[PDB]
């Protein structure tokens, strides 16, 4: 009968969908390869789709995945056995060298923009009209580590724009530098700021930025990936 | 502890944003409403503007129509008493013609001919409804994926009150504008067609329905526990995948084996959510047209 | 066997216990001593499973069904036939579960991410739990938890729930179904939203999150934004599952009566409960 009908066409229809949606999810990472970064025999039972090419606003130019894989950066870990599975350790120290929970990608080392051209992202003295709205104002707040240790005050929020948001604190070192903290990664107190992924030893590593009143995709990612990799590598020094 | 990131710690606000202009008519526009602090904690603080337009006045005036409609019914069957409006609030219940009028329009108006009327204003609402969410993205140039998984959920809705009853030769086949008269209304329904629970429709439905908060919450808490390195720029990841992106596809490939790129979860998303009214309103069609009794159709098949 | 990008993530550490020892994977599959734990609990249930098909006297995976013990063995042990194995099975599905989520938190450790997954997942898993240990143990009898079977767990879904008139009349059954449906909407909204962005008219270039910002205060005078969406997904996924556990603690223990009646103490208040005319009067 039609109802019979209607419900094998149906999954015949699924499985088809199902296919599609696995091979969209394909379009990044793909082809797999050997830990030596070869490619591997095995690919799985989907093809690699067509190429699909994304125009990208503000004359960044095209996108086409897949395409070219290739991490353009160096990676510092060695095999730690004769097969197949086994972790990678770490050659020098991972929090510098980026690998591990401290990774980065290097993507575009340009700022995003918002839907007008402009940076998306700007420290809060360079955005007009922009201010502490509700919540404690962290600016002029002491910053302590994972070792209880004050390793800086806040100078200034970096805000995105067009969503209204704070994204960064930046932060003043004793030497006078600054470094960016993701917001994501700190818990604002009345009479502080703490940061339980890094020691107040580790703050002075944190990448630097090119220009004072811009960060770029590349250098968010190397922050980011710092940041985080001190739950993994700070651990030693963390007490509570 | 660690911050979760669940509510904001600080909120920030500049300048009334307008927003992007591309083709739309800022005539239309209305001028921004004002912020409000307590959904700032969780969302965007903003309130407006909106777009008004044509196909919005419509649908809010029939909108708002048919919403009355139902309410001076309701006013009436509570003898116009407020006491009695509020007691019985969930009881009352505006009707559909009886199986005698068929698909006819001349039912008397306590009859049947008020819900007639109510209807026509809950159809052109939600069909113009529908134009708008289409135009608006039109005039942004953007894709209408919004439109058409909208148009999965207006499927369900018009199996329920339009296609079904058109084709069963009846009104009386719709479903009544009440609370609790359209929980009687579903439970009735599964009884009549011998137990919805044997109909394979519907169990796809289910699955569809369970799989949606399955993958909103795998989805949001993902985005959320990569958000210490701007996961939920999603267009960005997207355009230029960062390890926000990398470590969410690890997080899935190492767990389950699932394949999972940023613009890829979001087809699963749409998929996952449009099925569940898609299923559930063949499910529905066939039911008393092709398909009397579940129960029935299972053991045999056909 | 890696993505292209894989490698300088599969580092030492972050596992609970154990160690080195499991710290490898298996192809694609991160193991850890939870992922030998789940390997363990999951064969041992399925082998039970085997076994209770045996004594039933059915391969068929739709008839197969692993039945709690009946009501007169309360919260005792019952026979492996009449109950025990239902019983052992329950332990190995938790074992399991638990160890899943636990080889979860392993994976976010290594990967330097939050823990929101594995917090998500122990939502649905206190649902189980409900269902099979909270009611039950509150009740009194294993014997009001469901079966093991395709659709011999629908005929307890259907029976129980007509024990207590329509089961739509319960409270917290309404809110849970609530969520459930916002939850679905938002979903499709969320997806819809993004591919919109993403993959534009023919032609265009790539929108922005302004533009998602506009097209909803455009539509509807308000935008949660892309942080708030995310949020609210999760919020509204647990909540339903958090009302749908609430909505079955509560029913066989505080309220075992018809849940149509129970919106009685609303219609008698005494303010109106007189008030002729309408539907109660
Ligand atoms: C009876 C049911 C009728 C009830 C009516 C309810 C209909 C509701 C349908 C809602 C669909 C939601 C889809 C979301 C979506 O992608 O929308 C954007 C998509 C693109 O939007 P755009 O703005 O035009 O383009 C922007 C970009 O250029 C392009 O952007 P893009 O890349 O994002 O879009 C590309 C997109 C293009 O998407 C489509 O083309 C949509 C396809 C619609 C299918 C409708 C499903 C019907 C269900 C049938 C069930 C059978 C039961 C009987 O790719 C896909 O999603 C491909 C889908 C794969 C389907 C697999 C089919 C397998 C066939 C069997 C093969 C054998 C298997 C081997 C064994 O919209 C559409 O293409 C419109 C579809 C409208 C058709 C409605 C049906 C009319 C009746
Ligand atoms: C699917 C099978 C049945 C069905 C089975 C059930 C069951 C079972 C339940 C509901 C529930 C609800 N259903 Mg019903 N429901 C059906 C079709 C509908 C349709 C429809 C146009 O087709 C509508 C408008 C509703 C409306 C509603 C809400 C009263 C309630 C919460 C829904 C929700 O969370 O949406 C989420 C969506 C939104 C974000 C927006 C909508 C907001 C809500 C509040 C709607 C407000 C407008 C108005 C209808 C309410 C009037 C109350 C005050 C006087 C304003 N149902 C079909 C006929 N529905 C639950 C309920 O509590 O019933 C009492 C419940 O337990
Ligand atoms: C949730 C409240 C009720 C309930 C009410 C219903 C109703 C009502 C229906 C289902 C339906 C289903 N239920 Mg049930 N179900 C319950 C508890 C469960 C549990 C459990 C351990 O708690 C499990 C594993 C299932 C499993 C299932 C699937 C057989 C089926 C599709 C679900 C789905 O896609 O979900 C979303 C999840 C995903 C899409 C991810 C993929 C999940 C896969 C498909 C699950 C396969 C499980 C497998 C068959 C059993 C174990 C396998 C081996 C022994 C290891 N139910 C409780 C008792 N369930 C529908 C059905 O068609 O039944 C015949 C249906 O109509
Ligand atoms: C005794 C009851 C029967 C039963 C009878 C039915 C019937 C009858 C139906 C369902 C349907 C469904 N049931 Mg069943 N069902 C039972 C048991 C279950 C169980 C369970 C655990 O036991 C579950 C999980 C489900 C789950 C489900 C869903 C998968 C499905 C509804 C999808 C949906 O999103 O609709 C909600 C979404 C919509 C209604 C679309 C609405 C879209 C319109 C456009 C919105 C207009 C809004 C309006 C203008 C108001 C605006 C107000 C605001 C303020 C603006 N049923 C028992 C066996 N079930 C439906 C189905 O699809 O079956 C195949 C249905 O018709
Ligand atoms: C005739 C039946 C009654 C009824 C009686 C009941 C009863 C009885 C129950 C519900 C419950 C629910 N009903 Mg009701 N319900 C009815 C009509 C409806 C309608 C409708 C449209 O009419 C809807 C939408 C609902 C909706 C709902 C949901 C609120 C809730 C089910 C989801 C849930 O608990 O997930 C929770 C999710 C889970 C339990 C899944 C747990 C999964 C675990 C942790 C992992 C599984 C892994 C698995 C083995 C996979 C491995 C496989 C791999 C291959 C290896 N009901 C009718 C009126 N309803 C159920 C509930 O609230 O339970 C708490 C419940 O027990
Ligand atoms: C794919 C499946 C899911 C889905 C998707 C979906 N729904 C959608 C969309 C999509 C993708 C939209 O784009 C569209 C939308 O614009 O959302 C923001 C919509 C939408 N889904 C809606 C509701 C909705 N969707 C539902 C379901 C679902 N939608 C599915 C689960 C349900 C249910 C029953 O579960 C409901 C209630 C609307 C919010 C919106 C469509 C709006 C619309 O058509 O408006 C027409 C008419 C008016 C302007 C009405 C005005 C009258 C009311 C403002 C007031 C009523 C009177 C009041 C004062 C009191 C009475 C109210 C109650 C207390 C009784
Ligand atoms: C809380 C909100 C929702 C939610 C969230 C959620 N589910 C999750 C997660 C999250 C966040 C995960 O991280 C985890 C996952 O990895 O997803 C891919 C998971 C997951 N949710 C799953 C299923 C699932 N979730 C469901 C529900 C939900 N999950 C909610 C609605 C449902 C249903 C019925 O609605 C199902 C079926 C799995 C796909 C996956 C967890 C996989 C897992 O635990 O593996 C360990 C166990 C095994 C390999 C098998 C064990 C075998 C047993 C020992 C014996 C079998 C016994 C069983 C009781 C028989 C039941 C028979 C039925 C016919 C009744
Ligand atoms: C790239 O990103 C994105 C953004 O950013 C740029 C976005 O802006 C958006 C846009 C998103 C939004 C504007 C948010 C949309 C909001 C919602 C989908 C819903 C929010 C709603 C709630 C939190 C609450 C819902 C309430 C519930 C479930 C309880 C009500 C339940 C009841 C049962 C009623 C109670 C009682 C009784 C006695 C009778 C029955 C019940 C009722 C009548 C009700 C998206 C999608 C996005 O993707
Ligand atoms: C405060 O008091 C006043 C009077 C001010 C009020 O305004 C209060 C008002 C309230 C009390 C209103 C309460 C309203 C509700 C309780 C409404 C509940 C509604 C539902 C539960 C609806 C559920 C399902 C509805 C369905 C599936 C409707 C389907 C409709 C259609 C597909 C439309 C079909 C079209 C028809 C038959 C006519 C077509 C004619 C043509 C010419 C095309
Ligand atoms: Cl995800
Ligand atoms: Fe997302």
């Known amino acids: 009968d039609l109802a019979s009908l209607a419900i094998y066409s149906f999954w015949i229809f699924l499985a088809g969908l199902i296919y599609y949606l696995q091979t969209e999810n394909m379009r990044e990472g793909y082809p797999l390869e050997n830990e030596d970064g070869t490619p591997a025999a095995n690919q799985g039972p989907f093809p690699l789709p067509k190429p699909k090419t994304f125009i990208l606003p503000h004359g960044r130019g095209t996108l086409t995945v897949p395409g070219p894989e290739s991490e353009d950066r160096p990676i510092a870990l060695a095999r730690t056995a004769v097969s197949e599975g086994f972790p990678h350790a770490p050659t020098g120290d991972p929090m510098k060298d980026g690998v591990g929970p401290a990774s980065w990608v290097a993507r575009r080392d340009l700022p995003e923009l918002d839907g007008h051209g402009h940076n998306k992202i700007k420290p809060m003295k360079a955005a007009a009209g922009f201010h502490v709205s509700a919540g404690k104002n962290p600016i002029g707040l002491p910053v302590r580590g994972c070792d209880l240790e004050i390793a800086g005050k806040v100078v200034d929020i970096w805000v995105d724009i067009p969503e209204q948001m704070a994204r960064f604190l930046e932060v003043e070192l004793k030497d006078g530098s600054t470094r960016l903290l993701p917001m994501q990664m700190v818990k604002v107190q009345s009479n502080r700021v703490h940061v339980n992924a890094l ?11 090119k220009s004072p009143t811009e960060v770029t995709l590349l250098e968010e990612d190397k922050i980011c990936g710092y940041v985080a990799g001190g739950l993994m590598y700070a651990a030693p020094k963390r007490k509570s | 502890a660690e911050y979760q990131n669940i509510f904001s710690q600080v909120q920030v606000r500049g300048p009334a944003d307008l927003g992007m202009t591309e083709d739309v008519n800022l005539a239309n526009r209305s001028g921004v409403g004002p912020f409000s602090t307590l959904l700032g904690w969780f969302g965007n603080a903003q309130l407006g503007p909106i777009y008004l337009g044509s196909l919005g006045v419509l649908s809010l005036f029939s909108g708002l129509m048919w919403f009355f409609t139902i309410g001076i019914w309701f006013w009436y069957q509570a ?22 009028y068929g698909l006819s329009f001349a039912a008397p108006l306590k009859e049947g001919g008020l819900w007639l009327i109510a209807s026509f204003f809950m159809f052109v609402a939600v069909w113009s409804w529908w134009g708008r969410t289409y135009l608006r993205a039109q005039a942004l140039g953007m894709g209408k994926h919004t439109a058409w998984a909208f148009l999965s959920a207006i499927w369900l809705w018009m199996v329920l009150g339009f296609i079904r009853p058109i084709l069963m030769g009846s009104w009386s086949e719709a479903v009544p504008y009440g609370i609790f008269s ?15 629970f044997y109909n394979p429709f519907h169990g796809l439905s289910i699955a569809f329905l369970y799989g949606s908060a399955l993958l909103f919450a795998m989805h949001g808490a993902t985005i959320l ?23 969410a596809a690890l997080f899935w490939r190492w767990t389950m084996g699932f394949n999972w790129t940023m613009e890829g979860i979001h087809r699963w998303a749409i998929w996952m959510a449009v099925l569940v009214t898609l299923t559930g309103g063949i499910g529905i069609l066939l039911s008393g047209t092709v398909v009397d009794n579940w129960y029935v159709w299972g053991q045999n098949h056909g | 066997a890696l993505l292209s990008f894989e490698r300088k993530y599969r580092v030492p550490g972050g596992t609970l216990v154990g160690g080195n020892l499991f710290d490898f994977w298996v192809g694609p599959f991160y193991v850890g001593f939870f992922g030998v734990a789940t390997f363990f609990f999951a064969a041992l249930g399925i082998i039970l499973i085997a076994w209770s098909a045996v004594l039933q006297g059915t391969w068929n995976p739709q008839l197969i069904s692993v039945y709690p013990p009946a009501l007169e063995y309360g919260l005792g042990g019952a026979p492996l036939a009449k109950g025990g194995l239902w019983q052992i ?58 079966p093991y079977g395709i659709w011999t767990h629908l005929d307890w879904v259907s029976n129980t729930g007509y024990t207590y008139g329509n089961f ?15 939850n679905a909407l938002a979903l499709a909204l969320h997806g819809a939203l993004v591919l919109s962005a993403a993959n534009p008219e023919k032609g265009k270039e790539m929108r922005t999150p302004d533009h998602e910002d506009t097209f909803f205060r455009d539509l509807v005078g308000y935008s949660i934004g892309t942080l708030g969406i995310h949020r609210l997904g999760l919020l509204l996924s647990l909540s339903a599952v958090f009302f749908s556990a609430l909505c079955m603690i509560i029913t066989g223990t505080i309220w075992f009566d018809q849940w149509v009646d129970w919106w009685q103490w609303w219609v008698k208040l005494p303010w109106w409960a007189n008030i002729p005319g309408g539907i109660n009067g």
């Open chain 1, 199 to 209: 020691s107040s030893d580790l703050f002075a590593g944190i990448p630097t930025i």
């Open chain 2, 79 to 100: 003898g116009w008493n407020p006491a009695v409006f509020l007691r019985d609030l969930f009881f009352f219940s505006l009707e559909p013609p009886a199986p005698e």
């Open chain 2, 182 to 196: 359209h929980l009687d209304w579903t439970n009735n329904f599964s009884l009549v067609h011998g137990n919805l």
């Open chain 2, 225 to 247: 526990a990569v958000s210490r390195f701007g996961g939920e720029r999603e267009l960005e990841q997207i355009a230029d995948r960062g390890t926000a992106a990398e470590r």
């Open chain 3, 89 to 146: 099975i329950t332990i190995c599905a938790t074992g399991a579960f638990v160890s899943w989520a636990l080889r979860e938190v392993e994976i976010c450790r290594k990967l330097g991410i939050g823990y929101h997954i594995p917090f998500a997942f122990a939502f649905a898993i206190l649902a189980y739990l409900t269902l099979v240990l909270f009611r039950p143990v509150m009740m009194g009898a294993w014997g009001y938890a469901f």
């Open chain 3, 168 to 182: 739509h009349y319960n409270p917290a059954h309404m809110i849970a179904i609530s969520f459930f449906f916002t």
